[PDB]
Amino acid sequence: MDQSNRYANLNLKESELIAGGRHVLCAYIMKPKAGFGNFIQTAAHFAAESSTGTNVEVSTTDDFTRGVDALVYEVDEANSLMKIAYPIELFDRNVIDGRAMIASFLTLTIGNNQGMGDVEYAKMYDFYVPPAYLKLFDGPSTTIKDLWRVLGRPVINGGFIVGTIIKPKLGLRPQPFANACYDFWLGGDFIKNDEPQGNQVFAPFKDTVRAVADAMRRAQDKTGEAKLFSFNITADDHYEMLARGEFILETFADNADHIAFLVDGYVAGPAAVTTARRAFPKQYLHYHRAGHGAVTSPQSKRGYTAFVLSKMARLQGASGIHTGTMGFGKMEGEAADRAIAYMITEDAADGPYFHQEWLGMNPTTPIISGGMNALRMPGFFDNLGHSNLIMTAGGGAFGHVDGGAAGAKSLRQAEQCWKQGADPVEFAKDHREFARAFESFPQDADKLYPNWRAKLK
Amino acid sequence: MDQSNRYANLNLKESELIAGGRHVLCAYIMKPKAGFGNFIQTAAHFAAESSTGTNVEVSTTDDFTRGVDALVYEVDEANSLMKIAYPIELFDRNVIDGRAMIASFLTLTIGNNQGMGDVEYAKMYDFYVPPAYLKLFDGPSTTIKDLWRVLGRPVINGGFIVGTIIKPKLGLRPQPFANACYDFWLGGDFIKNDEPQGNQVFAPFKDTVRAVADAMRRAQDKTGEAKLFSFNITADDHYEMLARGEFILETFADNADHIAFLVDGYVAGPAAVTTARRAFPKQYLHYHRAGHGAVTSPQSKRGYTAFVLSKMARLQGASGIHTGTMGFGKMEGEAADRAIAYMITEDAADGPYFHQEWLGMNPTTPIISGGMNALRMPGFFDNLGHSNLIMTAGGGAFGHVDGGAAGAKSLRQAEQCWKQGADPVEFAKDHREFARAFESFPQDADKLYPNWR
Amino acid sequence: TTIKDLWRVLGRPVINGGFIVGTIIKPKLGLRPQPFANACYDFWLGGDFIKNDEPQGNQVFAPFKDTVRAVADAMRRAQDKTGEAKLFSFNITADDHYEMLARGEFILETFADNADHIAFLVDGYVAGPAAVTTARRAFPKQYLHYHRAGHGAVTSPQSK
Ligand SMILES: [Mg+2]
């Protein structure tokens, strides 16, 4: 059956839908399967499956139902574009506090529509949230501002947070793990657990947390500077997440405000993110997106983009989220992903299809991770336009010839170099640790700074 | 960094890895990106990223780390096949109870490896869980057995549970919603909330729950048979899920054991599933997989298959999960998906790559939903081989010419027809409601039963 | 939570959103639930914000649950008539931490889609820092209205 009469209204104007403030708008790149309806027919069916409908007419359908139908308001078949308007009354709300839930947004806008037999593929590229729905989201409670304050930096434009991941990803016992933390902290600010690190049998959670707490205390006493750690508290069980978080804060004691909580938000889901967000609003919530590539990759024609994911994470209340290296590291990414960073940090920003006003909702920090080092940094910062962010370089720090501490300093210096607009090769002459990064990663040094060896050694 | 020397050992035998009981095994269909390492090099890097490694050598790496490395033990480049052995010590365990978590399995085996710059794509098709790891998973607490007991059916081979979804998907107010439930329940057993139904402003949760409870009481008094409802308790907030669940059970009272709890497990995640599983172990946990098609579709070359999803759901403790219509309904699916059902229901079963022993872990029910009706059912049951399952037909029930109750009866009769081995067209002469399904869905009747007129 | 969050609910700009027109329903105590709610509705036809008077709560003549429900109905009616959002600041003060939680939780569930229109008033000087923190930590997303009743015993310039 053809449902385009009911679920398509191409005469609706996007500007009026936005001005009305009663509709969530979603922009998809969609292709119908061969042998079914045309583009508008398939889009109308997509809208029906994503709101009030099904594949057949039902006797229960009355007047009221029609008013909450999702509507295809714009199509561009040549570019495979479909835009759908979802009345805000469709989205589920908490009984306990009347607030919105991202689970409902996902269920309607990217749920059953992903398994439709007449659709080859459909991927969400952007969404618009009006004030009436936006204000019902948690939003971030803790921001980079709170990390800057702990570090003794200015709370506005406090700058670059030098970070790392203790490698190996898994395998280090509690004390060796803690010793590596101490070493890095002599030169750097921030350490994160690698995504799967927790309570493995060879590195029990409580032993590791205690050793790291001792290492932080020692590093702070030596350097006279505050240090930060992001612990993985991810679990299937809500109560396990609470047990981990509570143990950490009590253990760190006077250093409890130096602690972020990492959550594997993509694989554990929105429920895990919210547990951390609502139980620990005063602790920086570090959304780790491990597994997101299954849908967000440009190779994928389904689900949603990294842009959409990041925008949702801000609404969920992530204090920071991994935005990728934007083509400058080892993982998949593009230079145009800078727009992701601005969507999560600014009060107003443009997506690929919709302009978004955040109405003073707190920003989410871009966390930069994956195959970065001191040499690759100036190019990254040039593309982005700022260094108010966290960057974690595991290999870039501990792979430095002179070790972790020196590795941390080369990262520090690389951003200092970028900030003062200096030539990296010339800058390196007067900055040892940064100059030693060229020798640590020669392949990168030859590609990025072709004639470095002649000038430097 | 060529990391094949450390993270690849093709001389390891799969049979010995299984016999040892110390490794989770994963089977992936993978393709390297052009311009990087070869197949084995890329697989080794994949294994490193999925366990102990990174893209560069690090000074901190000691010899203990080497013992917990994931290892590529088998490759078949021509068929894009890569098999990896993950030592069970890698997987995270609860501090509170020492039990396993699926979140850790997912993070290692299908996490950061999905964003690697040197991999075009990689999708998991099967996994093997040894006894030492398997026994640490929750597993299902409630099964179809418990639903059969409530219905007054035999607890062994209690048969087909006739179900539906109250359509429209959203839009019905509490009393009209409840009236439709009552109507269906005159002929059927089971009703589920549609995946997004909850506490919308036009149909508040508490008003709807109360109206449905009244409708169940009325339908049970009229028919003299027990009726079942599966309520959506999904939420981002753990405490919201608890509030919904607790309210429902207190409201239904003496009918509280007639209630299943539906969780949008794919979009809300494992954390939401576990909340329901651990807080309400005595209530049938209905895993709704909405959104799964983003990765599970054969069109997708990434993430994991529907088979893998279903197998994980059993470990998580789903009492039932949607397995799709196996090519017989409106959604994407294939006849070979019958193997999904057997993996979730049997104590021993074969996946596409690994044989799995469940060690007496409870079964997860196959829930059949999406564009089904009485006409499409006999073909579905023939392919599967049994009718010990729940089937929900929204359009197939309320789209019936005579209405919901008659729609329910046509579904009942369609399974009776299959069970007896009768010809659907001839069976329909003696069974009105089933015969009226041909008239209700003529397009389907013409394809499946050409000369029905 | 700040005034920014109240401005957002009112549909005002989040920067310099301006003046929030408020009142206290007088008499301070004595109004039964429905007369109390009727007075709220009346004021809300022209104003934004209503606060409980400091001692208003669960008096025997105006039970807490009956009053909260009547006010919720009055807010809904006033918003439907005016087409503008309305705000209420409820007194949740108690000696018992769990009483404060019971009151707060009841209010938010009752107001439902209007739960972000609710502030929580605490008699912070007389009940003390412990009461303030209960509200602050249990309900961080609800505007915390510190009522200072009794402060004059020390803060007055007459006091040395
Ligand atoms: Mg990592």
Ligand SMILES: [Mg+2]
């Ligand atoms: Mg459905």
